[PDB]
């Protein structure tokens, strides 16, 4: 009746244990799934049009401090002043500026120049950098239409176009300067469905934005996300205002943690990254750049002053970040600090770092400061540093910093295992995970911190090359097509795999109206073809008709090469010969190879017929419908 | 020597069912816990305060 309940309950609640253990694992992953980055784009002063430029510059100890620009119409004559307290003047005349801010391609998005001059430059930079970042991911932007990808960004108002305007520009100034438009505008270009959010949290704005996206990504509200920052100064008044506080270095260079720190330095920049769930990224096979592990955001609250920070708040947010990531301080190795270079801020941050990380370190951890090369990039600043870390992780190298003469004396440098990067050091893989940390502290008091980890090891696969391959390229304009051809040739001058290049071209690119194709079998052949390209056809197609001829097309050795080339055609011709076998008296394969007299109608006509049938099959194989 | 397992298995497994069902309820509430409103203030035209 119920005597054999033993085995029954055994199997029953063994299954119960399995199911609900799986449930527990699911809840742990949903509350703490790591995130993955699959593409970055950056634009910084000094001609940094790619992460490679930034990595090269930091590896070569290159500064980017320049003089005030003049294109923006600023009246620098009445602003530069050795006198420090004269009204409406600045005692500095240097900084890291993005001198290429004005230029923009409105035609690519089909926008009339009226809006182009109307809209703020920051929106244009956001659009272009977003397109660049999406391209870097190897994802077709067109295919994103109708998808549910969200978007978050951080920016602050600049008063661009605050003066009186011509009556022609009516109907564009509002949306041109409307903040909430910007992110949404991007969606309008790409037709996305995810939420569009713009935030304002001073310098930390970018990092906070990223954190926000993470939460949404964990809640199943989107499949993938884009986040970044941008900052372009319309007027230099801030300089003058900061001249009042005397907090600006007359040299215009931030000497972070150096004993000769005397101020700060402003700068501009744009940066965008793409985030996705780790499991989904592995499922899609997207190449993983880095893994984002933990984030934390808090508020300074009551302190010494309105803008005076407190070390304890920074310690609290650091502990919260570590707890969320579930990692001990001993597990991290390198930190990119705020590195403002101010007299007062640096000691507090350093003491907080000593109190937090400087406890029981097996090895002296290292800290860096990107601002010493570029200055304070404000809203974008944060995300910029992240990219730097990623490159340092990819090259297995630890870049050094600049303007280091003597560590500040306010810090007991023997209180913990803390050392600076005066020189580059190798950071090889060892079998144990490598981790890095970033922090940011806004003037308003809000603070954020991030902890990221190296990507999982990947297994390369060797693929044989091919005899010959085609190379395609598409663009919206002929000149853009020429520029793309030039860039592709320049890259092809190096050492790459032709098959890999062809596959990437046919897989990780969109299709446009301006098109060009070159068939190559060697790298030098490819270079010659690319440099020799001269024409492109933007012709509207009509209707396709497959014309069939009569006679006279034949010649010696008809079906010899392509038989060995394309197996599908070989199968088709074999099937045709088998079907016509009940009436032949010769080897059709031989005669098409050229082993029979083709001057006989009873031979040539079936042979030509089979040739045409096979060619029609081949043309079908490439998806051509007559 | 193994006749002492059936009852132990039964007890273990009642405990497991109970606790992990409670855990599942916890995760459901974490996903969708309702929120309560406790304070409210406003300022609108028409003299409303």
């Amino acid at each position, epitope marked *: *009746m*119920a005597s*054999t*309940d033993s*085995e*029954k*309950v055994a*199997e*029953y609640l063994r*299954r*119960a244990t*399995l*199911d*609900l253990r*799986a*449930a527990r694992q699911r809840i742990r992953e949903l509350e703490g799934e790591p995130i993955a980055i699959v593409g970055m784009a950056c634009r910084l002063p000094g001609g940094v049009a790619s992460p490679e430029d930034l990595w090269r510059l930091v590896a070569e100890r290159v500064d980017a401090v320049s003089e005030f620009p003049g294109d923006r119409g600023w009246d620098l004559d009445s602003l530069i002043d050795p006198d420090r307290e004269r009204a409406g003047t600045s005692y500095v005349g240097q900084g890291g500026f993005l001198h290429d801010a004005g230029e923009f391609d409105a035609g690519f998005f089909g926008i009339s120049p009226r809006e182009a001059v109307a809209m703020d430059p920051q929106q244009r930079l956001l659009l272009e950098t977003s397109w660049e970042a999406l391209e870097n991911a190897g994802v077709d932007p067109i295919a994103l239409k109708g998808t549910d990808t969200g978007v978050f960004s951080g920016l602050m108002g600049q008063g661009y176009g605050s003066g009186a305007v011509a009556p022609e520009l009516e109907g564009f100034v509002t949306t041109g300067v409307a903040s909430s438009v910007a992110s949404g505008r991007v969606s309008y270009v790409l037709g996305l469905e995810g939420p569009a959010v713009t935030v304002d949290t001073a310098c930390s704005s970018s990092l906070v934005a990223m954190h926000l996206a993470a939460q949404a990504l964990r809640q199943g509200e989107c499949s993938m996300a884009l986040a970044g920052g941008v900052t372009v100064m319309a007027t230099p008044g801030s300089f003058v205002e900061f001249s009042r506080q005397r907090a600006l270095a007359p040299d215009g260079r931030c000497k972070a943690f150096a004993a000769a720190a005397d101020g700060t330095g402003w700068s501009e920049g744009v940066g965008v990254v793409v985030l996705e769930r780790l499991s989904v990224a592995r499922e899609r096979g997207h190449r993983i750049l880095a893994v984002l592990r933990g984030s934390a955001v808090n508020q300074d609250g009551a302190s010494n002053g309105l803008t005076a920070p407190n070390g304890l708040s920074q310690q609290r947010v650091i502990r919260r970040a570590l707890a969320a990531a579930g990692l001990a301080p001993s597990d991290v190795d390198v930190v990119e600090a705020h590195g403002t270079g101010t007299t007062l801020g640096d000691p507090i941050e350093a003491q907080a770092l000593l109190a937090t990380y400087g406890q029981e370190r097996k090895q002296p951890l290292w800290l860096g400061s990107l601002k010493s090369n570029i200055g304070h990039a404000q809203a974008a600043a944060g995300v910029a540093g992240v990219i730097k870390m990623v490159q340092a992780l990819r090259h297995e190298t630890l870049p050094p910093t600049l303007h280091v003469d003597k560590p500040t004396l306010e810090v007991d440098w023997s209180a913990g295992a803390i050392e600076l990067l005066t020189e580059a050091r190798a950071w090889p893989r060892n079998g144990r995970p490598r981790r890095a940390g970033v922090s940011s502290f806004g003037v308003s008091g809000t603070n954020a911190h991030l902890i990221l980890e190296e990507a999982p090891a990947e297994e390369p696969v060797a693929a044989p090359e091919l005899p010959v391959v085609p190379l395609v390229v598409s663009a919206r304009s002929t000149e853009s097509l020429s520029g793309q051809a030039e860039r592709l040739a320049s890259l092809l001058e190096g050492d790459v795999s032709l098959t890999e290049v062809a596959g990437a071209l046919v897989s990780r690119r969109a299709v446009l109206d301006e098109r060009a194709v070159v068939v190559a079998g060697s790298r030098e052949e490819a270079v010659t073809g690319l440099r020799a390209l001269n024409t492109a056809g933007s012709g509207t197609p009509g209707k396709v008709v497959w014309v069939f001829p009569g006679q006279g097309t034949q010649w010696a050795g008809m079906g010899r090469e392509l038989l060995a080339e394309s197996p599908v055609f070989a199968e088709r011709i074999a099937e045709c010969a088998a079907a016509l076998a009940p009436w032949i008296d010769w080897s059709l394969v031989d005669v098409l190879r050229g082993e029979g007299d083709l001057g006989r109608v009873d031979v040539l006509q079936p042979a030509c017929f089979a040739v045409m049938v096979g060619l029609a099959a081949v043309w079908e194989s490439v998806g051509v419908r007559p | 020597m193994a006749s002492t397992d059936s009852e132990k298995v*039964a007890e273990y497994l*009642r405990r497991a*069912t109970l606790d992990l*069902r409670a855990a599942r309820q916890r995760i*459901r509430e974490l996903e969708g816990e309702p929120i309560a409103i406790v304070g409210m203030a406003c300022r609108l035209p028409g003299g409303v305060a």
Partner: antibody
Amino acid sequence: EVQLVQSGGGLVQPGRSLRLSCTASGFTFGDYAMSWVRQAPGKGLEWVGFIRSKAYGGTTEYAASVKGRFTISRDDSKSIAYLQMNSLKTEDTAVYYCTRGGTLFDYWGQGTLVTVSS
Amino acid sequence: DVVMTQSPLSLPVTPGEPASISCRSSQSLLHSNGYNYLDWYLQKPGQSPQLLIYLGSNRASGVPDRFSGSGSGTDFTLKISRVEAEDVGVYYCMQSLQTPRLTFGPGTKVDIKR
């Protein structure tokens, strides 16, 4: 993950023999006890047989309807079950399934159609 | 002596609605351990059978959370908060205390209301 592969089906004359192989993967096969259940087309579900596990000795039990004609065997080393048709009849034509768990049929295979006709 | 169970034969349903299916037994499946022995299985049209419910209350993994069950003694009930289109097919409430279980019975066919 747990996955089942069923093979050995087809069309068979009356009164012949056949072998059905079920292969299990993605878990530890040695613990569970397996079962076989068929379904005639346009009908319900009827139990056929089952085999225990070596923990309890791995005895076998069969339905009296096909008693002595179909046999169940298991291979723990290869973790594959074998079910043998003997003295087949047309009415036995059905789609068959093998399931993990003697009492709980939690996991099911892709099924296998077997038709008996002359 | 051989226990048996009965459920409503068929019930048209409307997508997005709650639904409830009763299953009443010829005896109390409750055992000295403190458990009833009844499970609920579902077969979709032209697909392998799938397990839904076991020990009356607790729900197996993979099953959507919209399903639930309750009852005791000789009476039990499966409930679904939200009816969806793909949930058409046949369901079986089958005992497990009495062995050897032989046949699944006629079950219950579900269909779209119109």
